[PDB]
Amino acid sequence: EDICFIAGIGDTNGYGWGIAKELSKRNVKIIFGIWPPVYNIFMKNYKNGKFDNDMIIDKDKKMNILDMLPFDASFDTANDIDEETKNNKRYNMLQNYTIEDVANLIHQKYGKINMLVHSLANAKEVQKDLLNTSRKGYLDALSKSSYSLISLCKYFVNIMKPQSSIISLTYHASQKVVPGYGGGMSSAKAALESDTRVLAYHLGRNYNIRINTISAGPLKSRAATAINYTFIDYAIEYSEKYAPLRQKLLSTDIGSVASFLLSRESRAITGQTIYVDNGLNIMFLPDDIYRN
Amino acid sequence: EDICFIAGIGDTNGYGWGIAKELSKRNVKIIFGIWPPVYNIFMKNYKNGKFDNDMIIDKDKKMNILDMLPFDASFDTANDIDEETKNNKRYNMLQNYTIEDVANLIHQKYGKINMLVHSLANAKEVQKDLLNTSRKGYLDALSKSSYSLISLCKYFVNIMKPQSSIISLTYHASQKVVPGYGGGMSSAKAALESDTRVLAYHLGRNYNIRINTISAGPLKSRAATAINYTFIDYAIEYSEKYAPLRQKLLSTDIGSVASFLLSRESRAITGQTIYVDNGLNIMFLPDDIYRN
Amino acid sequence: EDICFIAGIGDTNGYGWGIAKELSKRNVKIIFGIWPPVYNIFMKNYKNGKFDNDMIIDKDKKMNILDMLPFDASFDTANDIDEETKNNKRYNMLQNYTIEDVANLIHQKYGKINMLVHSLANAKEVQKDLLNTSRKGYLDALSKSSYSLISLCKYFVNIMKPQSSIISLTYHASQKVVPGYGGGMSSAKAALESDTRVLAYHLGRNYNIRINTISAGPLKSRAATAINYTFIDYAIEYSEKYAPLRQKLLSTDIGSVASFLLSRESRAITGQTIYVDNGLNIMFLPDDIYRN
Amino acid sequence: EDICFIAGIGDTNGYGWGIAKELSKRNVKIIFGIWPPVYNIFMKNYKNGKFDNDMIIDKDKKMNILDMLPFDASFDTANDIDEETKNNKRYNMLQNYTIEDVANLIHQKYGKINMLVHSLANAKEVQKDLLNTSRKGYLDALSKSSYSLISLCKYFVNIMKPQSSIISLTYHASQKVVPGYGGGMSSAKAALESDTRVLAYHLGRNYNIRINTISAGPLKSRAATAINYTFIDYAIEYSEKYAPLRQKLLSTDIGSVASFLLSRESRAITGQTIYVDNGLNIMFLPDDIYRN
Numbered sequence A, B, C, D: 001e002d003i004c005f006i007a008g009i010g011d012t013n014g015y016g017w018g019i020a021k022e023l024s025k026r027n028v029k030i031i032f033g034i035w036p037p038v039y040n041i042f043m044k045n046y047k048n049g050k051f052d053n054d055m056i057i058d059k060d061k062k063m064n065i066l067d068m069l070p071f072d073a074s075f076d077t078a079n080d081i082d083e084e085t086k087n088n089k090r091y092n093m094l095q096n097y098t099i100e101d102v103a104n105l106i107h108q109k110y111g112k113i114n115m116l117v118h119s120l121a122n123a124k125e126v127q128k129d130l131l132n133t134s135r136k137g138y139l140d141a142l143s144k145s146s147y148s149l150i151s152l153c154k155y156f157v158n159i160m161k162p163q164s165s166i167i168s169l170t171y172h173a174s175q176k177v178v179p180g181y182g183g184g185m186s187s188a189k190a191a192l193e194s195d196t197r198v199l200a201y202h203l204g205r206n207y208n209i210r211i212n213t214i215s216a217g218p219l220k221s222r223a224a225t226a227i228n229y230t231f232i233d234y235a236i237e238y239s240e241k242y243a244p245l246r247q248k249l250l251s252t253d254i255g256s257v258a259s260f261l262l263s264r265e266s267r268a269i270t271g272q273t274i275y276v277d278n279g280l281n282i283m284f285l286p287d288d289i290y291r292n
Ligand SMILES: NC(=O)c1ccc[n+]([C@@H]2O[C@H](COP(=O)([O-])OP(=O)(O)OC[C@H]3O[C@@H](n4cnc5c(N)ncnc54)[C@H](O)[C@@H]3O)[C@@H](O)[C@H]2O)c1
Pocket: A007, A008, A009, A010, A011, A013, A014, A015, A016, A034, A035, A038, A071, A072, A073, A074, A118, A119, A120, A121, A122, A144, A168, A169, A170, A171, A172, A215, A216, A217, A218, A219, A220, A221, A222, A223, A224, A232
């Protein structure tokens, strides 16, 4: 009878969905937090059965989406939403979509929960290389993908039982440089990986709650493609060609690792970057003239 | 029908036993590899009912020990056994206890296995500190504690299914210095951790097998008490006071992590050091100032 | 005949000054970038000879401060300065103090330069632990101490010869948690250490310019004290008691390491975190019951 | 009046020679430690004028070689020398070439020294890959390439002044996997790097001596060509194409870094791996996509 809130699904091709899927296997109940620029479209599609293929696990196995909620990790409380957004065509009529508000909403409909998933990032100047990134873009990049965590945490902590567990998805570009992962994104993942440690410290001592981050390998998500055959087709090709594990990398591969961190089985792991990436990170050089 | 071989275990108060309990939850067959010198005394205790309590997994299921074999990580093959130990009282009443010998044995009787555990260390001069450690002592430590993993992998690979998984147990003394943990042990784990990556690539690319290592926090095992109010009673004292996670670290804590890494659920993780240490590894200074 | 611009001196008790000092030894000419809330006071004191003690190197050795400039790393170009600051009592009448403007000023008075020093940080909610840090505070923390680098870089790159070198000062709290280094500061140093890599990449390939960061140990600076005998007296005590090198840690110790990175001698080092900290970072545990 | 002993050098095309040139710039006396087997052929070349060109530091100063001694990193003391090598043609015409023997020698003739360099490696089975590497081979690699540093430190510490400095040369194959670099070499450097920390603490606390290691990028030395268009011609090719720093890495590049770490100028750096590799270590994937 565990409940998990997933911040950041827009379709079935992301890591969000992968996570959601494997969490169903373990019979855990799933709440989607959905960015308002996509909420209505995700909703409609779902009613249309556009996802019925993708909700299939195996033997009789569907999914169990408890609830689907509008949610914007930019806004901490309702006093944050600026007037222009408060009025936006997309945001206009949706309510309780800040971080503080969803916590309450969830706690009202379902009480305390014990699993929190951060699978989101956003950065305006991503296509600009770091050196040519504006201040206003960089701080945006960090607001939307680093802080959204810290803040998710402050607020969700009170609707969580002790022994609850939290995860987030990071990228190796934080540790080693991969060019064209810019406009703040590499800084943001770097900070997110440090905050994972510090938060683990406070949440551990104070609430008996754990937090970790998964350094994911390359997956063909909506957002991955949005990064301008692109950077992510190369990323995949390279990985499928050079990683120690040569199999294709599925979102469920991260999904099953996520479920594990989230469950009691990993109670002795906290503050860690766990790479789930067919082991690419362990490589230094292409092994070209070594494969002869 | 999964079989796991565990190399290194002389009692129930160690990590290997933590690992075996937790795998038995997943109905995994366990073969034990026991250091010849304690092999007979372990057999006797087993036979005398000393482990029946420790063998209970829960309400009407116990531990499924498929077999228990003498195994010595010092000797790769038959040729490697030296006169003094052919002589040696504890060794003479036993046979086929070299790495290549237990590999053929297991395989002769039960076929291919698919989970392998290296949970052993020896450092004749642990008592001394690195600077006062001798060449003979140091290398004995590297031989038994680091190379034994490579030799295990080489001889056991043939008898394992593709998509199999191997683990080792390491310690933070390799990354950050821990005074008292001497005689080569740090160097040994330092090498175990890197070999984990290198092997992760060879196994990864050639046999589609995965290999990871578990950085465990402190446990009051017999090996740990033999370092010596013992450089383990401090370790435990400090950890329970300072680690993000106030809980007391149990062997099964590592076992559950082992079980997972050894399963299909983690098919995309290879070559990693996975810290299962209540998060102690993330801390810099004691937090005495902060706690006020 | 090398010139260096030091962003971030307010007195003689910081790392800025340490760096400035050792750079004089190697006869390099020094330009101070000084935060306007302190500019006038630093100026007056200097004219008064309040620093004449502290400008002494050794035999006949004074310093050679080329020029002392107002400078605020918050503002990239003059179009950034908001009206309230444009009007502030402290900022009112000072000109050309944004990042873009000082670059020009310097290039006009002295042409191209070849050494850039980032020794600054600022964070509003430093006294708040991370979990209880506002978004607006965090993004501030990162703006002032992470981005100020990236932006210093964009702009200063064009007033720099190829083979010029750049450094910044970081703290170990980015890698391992030290509580009460909050309100964004640990995230900010974490990002700064990642940006050091990425910038090294671009500046290396494009301009033949190097960038590194120095993970400094604890020094009793103005700002260190401002962090609420405080956290930094403990930090020092602990370090002087537990670091492998038991000597007291001087700003000139970082200063001499800085000068080296900045000089040609280190032409093969870039993108690195170099710890200058009497080796504290290498420790895992206090060695209390080991010193018996 | 500073004396530096360099352990491991058979010609001018290596790193040790890079180190000696650059220290001679600082008027540091150089004692060479040469592997007995090449000691005589090196002596002859020296005598025959083959190094006169390489010995020029600049306009009217050459290299000050105080002495040149046979030195074998395999043997700590007299007792350690085995019959076959007492016999051995190359070895028999020589004496006092064990670690403890060259320590007493140097000290007998010239007193206390204050800079020590370990610039040597051997891996009998480098050609094989870790999985196919034998126990005898692996340990020989750890013995000659890793433990020889500890033994050097122990026997040389007495004959060194407080505030002295020791360096070792390492390689990234220990952190991230490099296929081809086999037979134990990775494990060896993996251990050299951790020992550097542990020794950094013992030396640090007890004798006020410092110890660091230099992670060098590739150089076409005789040792490197003997790995084998050679797993060094790739290394160099790749590095000059991909490393942030387009320059061609010279031995003196490392030498200047060595000189510095070995000086007082770095009194606050101990226990560190310092990458002197044109920054190649910071990169993740080749940047082919980006460069377009
Ligand atoms: N796919 C990869 O190659 C890859 C690799 C490593 C890490 N990641 C990480 O995985 C996570 C998910 O990305 P993905 O690759 O699955 O693509 P994705 O497009 O599925 O994920 C982005 C999701 O976050 C949501 N989102 C964006 N901005 C938001 C905001 N302000 N508030 C609330 N929600 C918002 C979007 O609706 C979208 O569904 C990110 O943390 C990303 O950095 C992805």
